[PDB]
Design an enzyme around this catalytic site. Structure first.
Site, PDB file in Angstrom:
ATOM      1  CB  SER A 133      -0.608   1.867   4.428  1.00  0.00           C
ATOM      2  OG  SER A 133      -0.036   3.114   4.772  1.00  0.00           O
ATOM      3  N   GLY A 163       0.727  -1.180  -0.034  1.00  0.00           N
ATOM      4  CA  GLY A 163       0.069  -0.085   0.009  1.00  0.00           C
ATOM      5  C   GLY A 163       0.650   1.267   0.075  1.00  0.00           C
ATOM      6  CB  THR A 164      -0.241   4.867  -0.701  1.00  0.00           C
ATOM      7  OG1 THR A 164      -1.270   5.159   0.250  1.00  0.00           O
ATOM      8  CG2 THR A 164      -0.853   4.460  -2.074  1.00  0.00           C
ATOM      9  CB  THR A 165       4.364   6.384   2.196  1.00  0.00           C
ATOM     10  OG1 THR A 165       5.051   5.642   1.287  1.00  0.00           O
ATOM     11  CG2 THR A 165       4.991   6.356   3.417  1.00  0.00           C
ATOM     12  CD  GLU A 178       3.018   7.585  -2.169  1.00  0.00           C
ATOM     13  OE1 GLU A 178       3.466   7.673  -3.140  1.00  0.00           O
ATOM     14  OE2 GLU A 178       3.239   6.799  -1.212  1.00  0.00           O
TER      15      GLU A 178
END
Ligand code: CL
Lengths: 111, 195, 244, 235, 240, 250, 243, 231, 241
Positions: free
Chosen positions: G74, G29-31, G46
């Site tokens: 995330s 997943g995204t930060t 993010e």
């Protein structure tokens, strides 16, 4: 002991002509000897050229009209936007009322 | 409903039941048969609350008939009476009890003896030589206590029964429109058409 | 999920057999032999205890023969714990019938209901079947003396003489040879013991490895008596027939 | 094993796809819609000559204005018909009117996907639902165990479906009479059936606004079979 | 509650549990039904690997559902008791609400419905039983014979057989039964039923059961000697 | 969520074995030895206290448990399974007997109830069998003294004397030579200690051995006086000191 | 083997492989990050701009619980929403019975026990998210991070997602360089920088920045989103540092 | 492979294969397009038939006077989810006298789909949805995936060959967003968008399906001769 | 071999899931120790905070179950907290139902019974934790009772748990051989804590700072944990002797 019913007064009247029909009602709303409102409408356009009024105990009256308006909405969703005929509306309202046979809506209904 | 009687003689059981059905100030019917055949040699008469009576009678009838088919065998009058008693004993502590009183007349084919059971709506069972429900017993019992003998014939039992109906027709306030009489013996159940 | 660990106890094989029922019958074939013989004036129940130890309390013991009511008894072959579950159910059922009809339950009705319970475990619920076969011995006023058997499938049948458990094939052949219809109880007692003595996996048949019971009309006038034999009474009946 | 409601890598439900294979093994059923009415016909397919063919009930009434034909595991259709009849009558009770053919079909199709770990498996039967209402007139619907239904001018289901459907593609036009449709169902059934078609091993039915849903007698169908044979020989 | 879907579809579109239940029926003892002009006869095989049996008390193969309808079967014996019980209960329930006994078609339709329900219910296996249901509708003299099977399908038959070697006896019935002229009398119908079983059975001793059903709740089971007379008569005509 | 294991985890194999029961018995075999001996005027049950660590207080872990004032129990196999069975056994003696009849159950019937609980763990959904064999000693007015063994299958057998667990085969042979029908309670205690020494390896004293009797009534252990009919418990756990006294004249 | 096919099964190591497999979904997943400050906490995340067709500012990922707690996560976004919905039910019942708003440590354990419960049975799947959350209560500021196993601790700074290592390294520098403490307005600026620096591990698609905060002085102890001038100011600070 | 037997199982790389297989059912579905301006929101859908004798499967469903969606994938699953939306819109009106925000509609669908991906026995929904609506914050377009992920967009497309229409809308973004107070032109842009996903087939009168909602326009669907204007 | 996935018997009468839960116990790589004084019960455990970003005050494996009972856990924190919450609820319910404070050994038995259920019921997994309960019981005095994933429990004179448990165990064994008594013959709890740390240092062979340790103390009518400065004060006293 708590009494779940009340009387909001008022009177209604429906007449049918050859190619038309009227449904009239006074706009006064009362409890005991006091006036609650001089203009509180109780005759409603429910869609599909059906007008309705449920006179007596206003809380039950509003609940019934609210449920019937909702019944018309779902009739369209379930039956391809078919127009609800006045005879079909009448039969549907019977089931709404009789559904509370042992705790009735304290109202006189005219469509 | 109202009048149901029963007499056990030497070789048979005789049940007499009133024909009137009254509701309010009107006699709606004067030919009502207040009885159900539970099995070929067992008959039940009934009286009590409107609706409950026939509903209960037919429910018992269905259960006994079911038993007969399952086992290919007829239950004894004693066994049927005990089943009926238990059903009424359950009923009395229900939310809405069966308000039904019954008489069960049967001929036990294994013992070769007639049997008469009296059961009220509470589930109170007694085996008797003669029985009644309601106000009927208040008139007929003293008559039966006197005239009844244990060795009587079916014909003698019918004459004894005529004597009871005559006393009821004389002293009872209500018109019960006569009775339907049925005999239970070794050959089964039959109705007397001219009474 | 849990699907992974399901044995599927209530399914058919490709041949149309119930796996678990067949395997339960295989279990029962290793249990001590039990024999029932029906005579004109009574019924005999004989059963062999499973390899006994000398320090086992023999008199205050019950493994094979159980009383259901005053008129009906059963001989057991299989898991004892499973049998006791079913026996208590059968005892209760008999009392329900008596309470309802004021008459002692007819033998077949009790057998059918107990067999119907076994059937249920083979069709629904996903549970293992009861690893038990019964021999029912009893009396009622309709059919008189009766012998039945039931097995894990929930199927039951009536018999003049029958065996369950180990060596039934050999036992049934011997019973089929010496049985006749006008037989008396005392003759049936002798046949039962002689059959066990020849089919046993033990060296010699003794009193401490047996349970015995009769159902006679040998009481006083038109009534039935159940006699579960004591150890000393089995010792005597074994001598009286000349087995020991 | 594996879950009953599992998806395949191609994005289809295994059990639904497998039930479609059962329907292909079923006996043939054909329906044709016209402006004069809708015709429904089926292959009876008796497994043995001793079986009394008139007891084979593969065409069924739902209401006076709606009829139904089936193909596949026909035992599975009983609870579907029961639901359809109840839905049709219940709607009449609540609304004092006839229920639309499409609304009936949608109600039946709602049962379809109510399976999993509700019933244990999908239905193994397809239905042809034919009827009439005031709004949309004469209609024919094909109801599958996937929960999907298509309206059709003409449709065949069962073992001889793909061959019969190709034949219906050529023969159907928007001006077919009822009589022309009757003969067309008999013609196409005779082509795909194994045994020779007669009044005992095939059954016709129709639904019209005027007379409602009617299953034809064996005498009436026999004359239509004779009329069909004569017309094919006449050119 | 145990929920597992035991009856499910396979890639080829078969429900194996239902099909394996049919194999259990194929293993069962043979049963046959033949209807005449004024009667229906149900014949049943009883295997003779069981001597020392008590025939008084042993469950009979043909069961009365009501006084006017009977049910025989082939397959698992324990499974059949459950269907018979439910059928008997529904028979009495019908009399109670409709005030008329069940038709043979209705009773068949009920039993077949129960069998179907067990093919798409979780946690249950199908019944390993096929039934023959015969009798006469109330106030009707037209003979009725129906068949059911584990899948739930049912149908009417002029004559039919089920169980082991049923394909052999069905072959016999298919050439010996005339639709235009069914067995005119009771004797003719029983004889044709006994003949059909003699193609498969072994000995005509205590291996064949025969039950005759006539109109207006007239049902009776034949004894050994009565059946043995049919066996003796058929064999003497055969030697020709 | 929710228990989806509504099916049996113990099933018949093609050969007719119930695998999980057999494997439970195997767990009992691994367990420490325990025994029971029936005398004319009493019953003795004994076992070794296998300490998990010398820092552990073995007094706090009781292998011999009171079920009723006249019934006691000991086991071989899995300790935790035993502990919960004792809880359930104590409760069932009240719920299905004492609260109905106003008196404690006889030994055979309490044993029967424990056997039922263990049988259900062999057939019910989503559970394994209990991994223990019990020895239950007790007394009641109409049956006198008795000794029972209960296995993982739910089967139970009455015994004059027996042993279960690690060295049960040898211990049973030892008991056969010594047991007679005229044994007094003190003689049975003596034989119990002799039999147990064979299976014990390390220390053999009142702190490593657990032993209880079912014998005469103990008014001093009742806790009150005034009711003549109430005479006290027949179950008594021997103290560490009482064991050592009998180990000198061994 | 086969130990990894079912949830709640211990491997011979004493591990639950299904939970470790859920961690892989989180790492994908995204930060997202969390920074604890003087009198509160700051959250940032993010948002990958997959297409021009995404409406800017209108796919909000940070979520509020009650009126004083912020949550960001995330991994599988739906799983995070399910956890927040539970968190909202837990916080509502606490306030219902006890009147006072739920303390952060109390709230942390409510989520922890719920996530842990999804490692006890094979009939449920573990959560595919690591959740960074916190807020202000009577005892001051608290920052937490919760993992699929149900494991959580208090943090000075927290990070999870594809650029977690980069973000962690940058977080550790702030802790070392500011022992006395970081201010709320500073932490917002630093949060922007760290997301931009952590974006280097996800640099194919360009991204959208989203920040929120709770502070006793700056937001009066309530959770608010950073928007407008304060957001653009934080973006500019981050843009200046990468170049 | 070994990790796709049910939705409750993660793969070693952290994937849910049953959810991915459900996603695959959408890719097989017929193309449908969604786009909006500041005043109106439009759905365009290519309908699919079984053969020339059959009808064309309806793709667009009305949820309220101000909201509705288009579908791609398993149609019965769309019926279940649309029914749920009809109820949620309805609850909002009866209880709060409030039109349901299009954003909340998305949040509710996300949470309903999610529960089916974390429990044993169930399965994921096998359909994708494009929800359009007009509420108190203007026009809206949402994309629903059965993984649970819901996304708000200016325009998008789902189904087979949806990449063509999605690329076109990405180029046309600046143009169609400013088509305010002009319904017919916004539809024209949507019809041109779906045309970029056609192969061998063209838009006919009983093939095309259009829906629109906006400032002074209730959610209405156009089929048959009413879409002849746009071919 | 599905007998290794759920809690059913293997052919040799073993429960592999229980055995593997025992191995999860050491996943944290932390050693704990418990001893008894005259008036008190002391428990100590290692505290390892590897990440610099962690708030060290929130990292703990000691729990205050009730006012009188404390509990240290050896195993992963999620299962530890699961056990702690249940114990707290059980202790509270006991007080409400029976009118007195739940004894340490009774709570140990209850939690051990709960653990036993997970070894017998299939749908529930065992918790991968070992629970050491400590108190000064009003009847039994200083008490140490320990629970494991098998459902086993017993009282202890003293105990140790963790990867290097055996070294600590024998170190304590050798002391009680020498002292000839069941406890630490010391008046104040401060010196009993000093004994505990001293013998842990000898057994493990490592030195400890104030942040490397975690201490819980049970006295009459209260159990409490020590702060870093309380431990530092204790470390200074050991060094100056
Ligand atoms: Cl407990």
């Amino acid at each position: 002991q708590f009494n779940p019913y009340g009387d909001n007064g008022g009177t209604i009247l429906g007449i049918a002509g050859e190619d038309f029909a009227v449904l009239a009602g006074d706009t006064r709303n009362i409890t005991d000897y006091s006036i609650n409102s001089r203009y509180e409408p109780k005759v409603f356009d429910c869609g599909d050229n059906i007008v309705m009024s449920a006179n007596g105990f206003a809380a039950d009256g509003d609940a019934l009209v609210k449920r019937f308006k909702n019944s018309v909405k779902w009739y369209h969703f379930d039956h391809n936007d078919k127009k609800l005929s006045i005879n079909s509306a009448a039969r549907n309202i019977q089931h709404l009322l009789y559904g509370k046979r042992f705790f009735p809506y304290y109202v006189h209904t005219i469509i | 409903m109202d009048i149901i009687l029963g007499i056990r003689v030497q070789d048979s059981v005789i049940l007499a039941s009133s024909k009137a059905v009254t509701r309010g100030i009107s006699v709606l019917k004067d030919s009502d048969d207040k009885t159900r055949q539970l099995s070929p040699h067992t008959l039940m008469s009934f009286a009590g609350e409107a609706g409950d009576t026939v509903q209960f009678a037919e429910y018992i009838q269905a259960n006994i008939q079911l038993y007969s088919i399952r086992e290919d065998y007829e239950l004894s009058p004693q066994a049927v009476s005990s089943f009926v008693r238990q059903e009424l004993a359950k009923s009395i502590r229900s939310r809405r009890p069966y308000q039904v009183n019954v008489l069960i007349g049967g001929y036990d084919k294994k013992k070769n003896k007639p049997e008469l059971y009296q059961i009220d709506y509470l589930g109170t069972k007694v085996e008797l030589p003669y029985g009644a429900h309601g106000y009927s017993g208040f008139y007929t019992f003293s008559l039966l206590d006197h005239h009844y003998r244990p060795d009587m014939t079916t014909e003698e039992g019918l004459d004894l029964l005529k004597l009871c109906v005559q006393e009821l027709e004389k002293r009872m306030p209500m018109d019960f429109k006569g009775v339907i009489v049925k005999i239970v013996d070794k050959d089964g159940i039959r109705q007397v058409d001219d009474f | 999920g849990s699907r992974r660990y399901d044995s599927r106890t209530t399914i058919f094989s490709p041949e149309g057999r119930l796996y678990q029922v067949e395997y339960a019958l295989e279990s029962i074939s290793h249990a001590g032999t039990a024999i029932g013989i029906m005579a004109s004036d009574g019924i005999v129940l004989a059963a062999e205890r499973k390899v006994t130890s000398t320090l086992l309390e023999q008199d205050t013991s019950t493994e094979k023969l159980y009383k259901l009511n005053d008129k009906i008894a059963v001989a057991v072959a299989g898991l004892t714990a499973d049998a006791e579950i079913l026996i208590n159910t059968a005892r209760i059922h008999a009392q329900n019938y008596l309470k309802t009809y004021n008459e002692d339950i007819p033998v077949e009705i009790l057998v059918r209901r107990l067999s119907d319970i076994k059937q249920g475990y083979t069709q629904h619920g996903g549970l293992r079947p009861f690893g038990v076969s019964f021999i029912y011995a009893g009396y009622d006023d309709r059919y008189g003396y009766q012998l039945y058997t039931s097995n894990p499938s929930g199927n039951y049948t009536g018999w003049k003489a029958i065996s369950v458990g180990a060596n039934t094939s050999a036992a049934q052949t011997l019973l089929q040879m010496d049985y006749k219809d006008d037989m008396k109880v005392d003759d049936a007692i002798e046949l039962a013991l002689k059959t066990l003595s020849k089919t046993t996996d033990s060296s010699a048949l003794t009193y401490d490895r047996l349970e015995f019971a009769t159902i006679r009309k040998g009481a006083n006038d038109g009534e039935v008596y159940q006699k579960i034999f004591k150890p000393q009474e089995i010792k005597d009946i074994l001598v009286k027939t000349g087995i020991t | 094993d594996r879950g009953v409601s599992t998806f395949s890598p191609e994005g289809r439900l295994f059990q639904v796809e497998y039930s479609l294979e059962a329907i292909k093994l079923g006996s043939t059923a054909i329906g044709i819609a016209t402006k004069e009415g809708v015709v429904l016909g089926v292959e009876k397919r008796a497994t043995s000559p001793l079986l009394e063919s008139d007891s084979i009930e593969k065409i069924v009434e739902i209401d006076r204005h709606i009829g139904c034909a089936m193909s596949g595991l026909t035992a599975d259709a009983r609870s579907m018909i029961e639901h359809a009849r109840t839905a049709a009558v219940t709607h009449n009770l609540y609304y004092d009117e006839d229920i639309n053919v499409e609304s009936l079909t949608q109600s039946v199709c709602d049962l379809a996907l109510r399976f999993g770990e509700l019933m244990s498996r999908p239905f193994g039967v397809a239905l042809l639902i034919a009827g009439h209402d005031a709004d949309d007139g004469y209609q024919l619907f094909h109801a599958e165990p996937s929960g999907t239904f298509y309206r059709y001018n003409a449709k065949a289901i069962g073992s001889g479906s793909e061959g019969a459907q190709a034949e219906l593609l050529n023969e159907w036009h928007s001006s077919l009479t009822l009589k022309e449709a009757e003969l067309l169902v008999l013609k196409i059934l005779k082509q795909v059936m194994e045994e020779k078609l007669d009044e005992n091993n095939a059954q016709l039915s129709c639904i019209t606004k005027q007379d409602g849903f009617k299953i034809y007698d064996n005498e009436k169908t026999a004359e239509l079979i004779k009329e069909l044979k004569e017309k094919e020989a006449a050119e | 509650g145990y929920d597992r879907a035991l009856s499910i579809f396979s890639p080829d579109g078969h429900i194996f549990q239902v099909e394996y239940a049919l194999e259990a029926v194929k293993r069962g003892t043979c049963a046959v039904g033949v209807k005449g002009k004024n009667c229906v006869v149900l014949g049943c095989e009883r295997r003779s690997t069981l001597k020392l049996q008590d025939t008084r008390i042993t469950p009979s193969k043909v069961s009365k559902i009501d006084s006017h309808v009977v049910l025989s079967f082939s397959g698992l014996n324990a499974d059949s008791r459950i269907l018979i019980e439910k059928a008997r209960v529904e028979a009495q329930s019908h009399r109670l609400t409709l005030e008329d006994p069940v038709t043979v078609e209705y009773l068949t339709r009920y039993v077949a419905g129960v069998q179907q329900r067990y093919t798409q219910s979780g946690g249950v296996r199908p019944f390993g039983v096929s039934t023959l249901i015969a009798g006469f509708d109330p106030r009707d003299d037209e003979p009725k014979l129906y068949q059911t099977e584990p899948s739930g399908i049912y149908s009417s038959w002029s004559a039919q057989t089920i169980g082991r070697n049923s394909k052999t006896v069905r072959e016999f019935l298919e050439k010996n039964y005339d639709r235009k002229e069914p067995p005119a009398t009771v004797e003719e119908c029983v004889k044709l039923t006994v003949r059909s079983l003699l193609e498969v059975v072994q000995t005509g001793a205590k291996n064949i059961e025969i039950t005759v059903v006539k109109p207006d709740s007239d049902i009776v089971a034949l004894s050994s000697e009565e059946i043995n007379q049919y066996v003796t008569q058929i064999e003497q005509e055969k030697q020709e | 969520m929710t228990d989806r294991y509504s099916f049996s985890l113990t099933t018949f194999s093609p050969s007719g074995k119930l695998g999980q029961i057999d494997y439970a018995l195997t767990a009992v075999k691994q367990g420490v030895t325990s025994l029971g001996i029936k005398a004319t005027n009493g019953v003795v049950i004994a076992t070794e206290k296998k300490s998990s660590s010398p820092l552990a207080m073995s007094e706090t872990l009781s292998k011999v448990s009171l079920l009723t004032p006249d019934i006691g129990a000991v086991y071989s196999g899995m300790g935790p399974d035993y502990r919960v069975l004792v809880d359930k056994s104590r409760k069932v003696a009240h719920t299905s007997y004492k609260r109905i009849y106003g008196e404690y159950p006889p030994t055979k019937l309490l044993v029967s109830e424990v056997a039922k609980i263990m049988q259900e763990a062999t057939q019910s959904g989503g559970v394994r069998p209990f991994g223990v064999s019990l020895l239950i000693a007790g007394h009641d007015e109409f049956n006198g003294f008795s000794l029972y063994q209960v296995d993982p299958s739910g089967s139970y057998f009455p015994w004059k004397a027996t042993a279960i667990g690690k060295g049960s085969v040898a211990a049973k042979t030892f008991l056969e030579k010594r047991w007679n029908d005229e044994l007094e309670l003190e003689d049975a205690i003596h034989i119990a200690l002799l039999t147990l020494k064979e299976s014990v390896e390390g220390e053999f004293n009142g702190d490593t051995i657990e032993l209880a009797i079912i014998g005469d009534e103990n008014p001093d252990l009742l806790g009150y006086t005034g009711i003549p009919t109430d005479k006290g418990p027949r179950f008594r756990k021997l103290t560490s000191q009482e064991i050592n006294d009998r180990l000198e004249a061994l | 083997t086969g130990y990894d096919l079912s949830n709640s099964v211990f491997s011979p190591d004493g591990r639950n492989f299904q939970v470790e497999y859920a961690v892989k979904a989180v790492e994908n997943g995204t930060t997202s990050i969390g920074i604890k400050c003087n009198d509160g906490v700051v959250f940032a995340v993010e948002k990958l701009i997959t297409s021009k067709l995404l409406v800017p500012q209108k796919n909000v990922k940070i979520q509020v619980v009650d009126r004083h707690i912020g949550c960001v996560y995330s991994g599988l976004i739906p799983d995070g929403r399910h956890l927040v919905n539970r968190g909202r039910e837990e916080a509502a019942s606490f306030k219902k019975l006890y009147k006072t708003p739920i303390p952060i440590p109390a709230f942390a354990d409510r989520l922890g026990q719920y996530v842990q419960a999804h490692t006890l049975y094979n009939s449920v799947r573990p959560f595919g998210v690591s959740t960074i959350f916190g807020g202000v209560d009577k005892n001051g500021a608290h920052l937490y991070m919760l993992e699929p196993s149900g494991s959580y601790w208090g943090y000075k700074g927290a990070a999870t997602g594809k650029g977690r290592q980069s973000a962690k390294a940058e977080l550790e520098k702030l802790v070392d360089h500011h022992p006395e403490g970081l201010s709320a307005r500073e932490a917002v600026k630093q949060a922007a920088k760290i997301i931009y620096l952590a974006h280097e591990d996800n640099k194919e698609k360009d991204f959208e920045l989203e920040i929120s905060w709770c502070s006793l002085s700056e937001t009066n102890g309530l959770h608010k989103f950073v928007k407008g001038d304060l957001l653009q100011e934080a973006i500019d600070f981050a843009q200046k540092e990468i170049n | 492979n070994n990790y796709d037997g049910d939705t409750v199982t993660f793969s070693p790389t952290g994937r849910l294969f049953q959810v991915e297989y459900a996603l695959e059912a959408i890719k097989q579905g017929s193309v449908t397009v969604g786009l909006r301006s500041n005043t109106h929101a439009v759905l365009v859908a290519l309908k699919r038939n079984a053969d020339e004798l059959s009808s064309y499967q309806k793709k667009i469903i009305k949820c309220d006077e101000h909201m509705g969606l288009s579908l791609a994938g398993l149609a019965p699953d769309a019926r279940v989810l649309s029914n749920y939306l009809r109820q949620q819109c309805n609850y909002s009106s009866l209880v709060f006298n409030r039109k349901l925000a299009v954003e909340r509609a998305g949040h509710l669908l996300c949470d309903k789909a999610q529960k089916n991906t974390q429990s044993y026995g169930g399965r994921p929904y096998g359909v994708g949805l494009l929800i359009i609506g007009y509420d108190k914050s203007g026009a809206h377009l949402l994309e629903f995936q059965p993984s649970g992920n819901v996304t708000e967009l200016y325009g998008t497309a789902i189904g087979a060959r949806s990449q063509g229409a999605k690329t076109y809308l990405e180029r046309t973004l600046d143009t169609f967003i400013k088509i305010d107070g002009n319904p017919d032109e916004l539809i024209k842009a949507g019809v041109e968008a779906i045309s970029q996903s056609l192969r061998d087939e063209s838009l006919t009168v009983d093939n095309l399906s259009i829906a629109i909602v906006g400032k002074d326009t209730p959610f209405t669907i156009y089929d048959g001769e009413a879409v002849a204007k746009y071919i | 071999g599905y007998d290794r996935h759920i809690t059913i018997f293997s052919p040799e009468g073993r429960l592999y899931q229980v055995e593997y839960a025992f191995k999860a116990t050491n996943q944290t790589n932390i050693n704990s120790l418990a001893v008894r004084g005259k008036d008190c019960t002391v428990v100590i455990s290692q505290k390892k905070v590897p990440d610099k970003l962690l708030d060290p005050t929130t990292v703990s494996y000691i729990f205050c179950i009730s006012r009188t009972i404390g509990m240290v856990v050896n195993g992963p924190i999620p299962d530890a907290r699961n056990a702690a919450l249940r114990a707290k609820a059980e202790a509270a319910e006991f007080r409400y139902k029976y009118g007195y404070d739940m004894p340490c050994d009774v709570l140990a038995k209850r939690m051990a019974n709960l653990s036993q259920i997970y070894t017998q019921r299939a749908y529930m997994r065992p918790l991968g934790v070992i629970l050491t309960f400590v108190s000064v019981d009003e009847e039994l005095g200083p008490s140490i009772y320990k629970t494991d994933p098998a459902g086993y429990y017993v009282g202890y004179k003293a105990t140790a748990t963790g990867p290097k448990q055996q070294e600590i165990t024998t170190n304590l064994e050798n002391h009680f051989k020498k002292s000839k008594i069941d406890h630490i013959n010391e008046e104040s709890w401060e010196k009993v804590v000093e004994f505990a740390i001293t013998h842990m240092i000898d057994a493990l062979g490592t030195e400890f700072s104030k942040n490397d340790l975690e201490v819980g103390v049970a006295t009459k009518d209260k159990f409490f944990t020590l702060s870093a400065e309380n431990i530092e004060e204790r470390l200074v006293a050991i060094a100056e002797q």
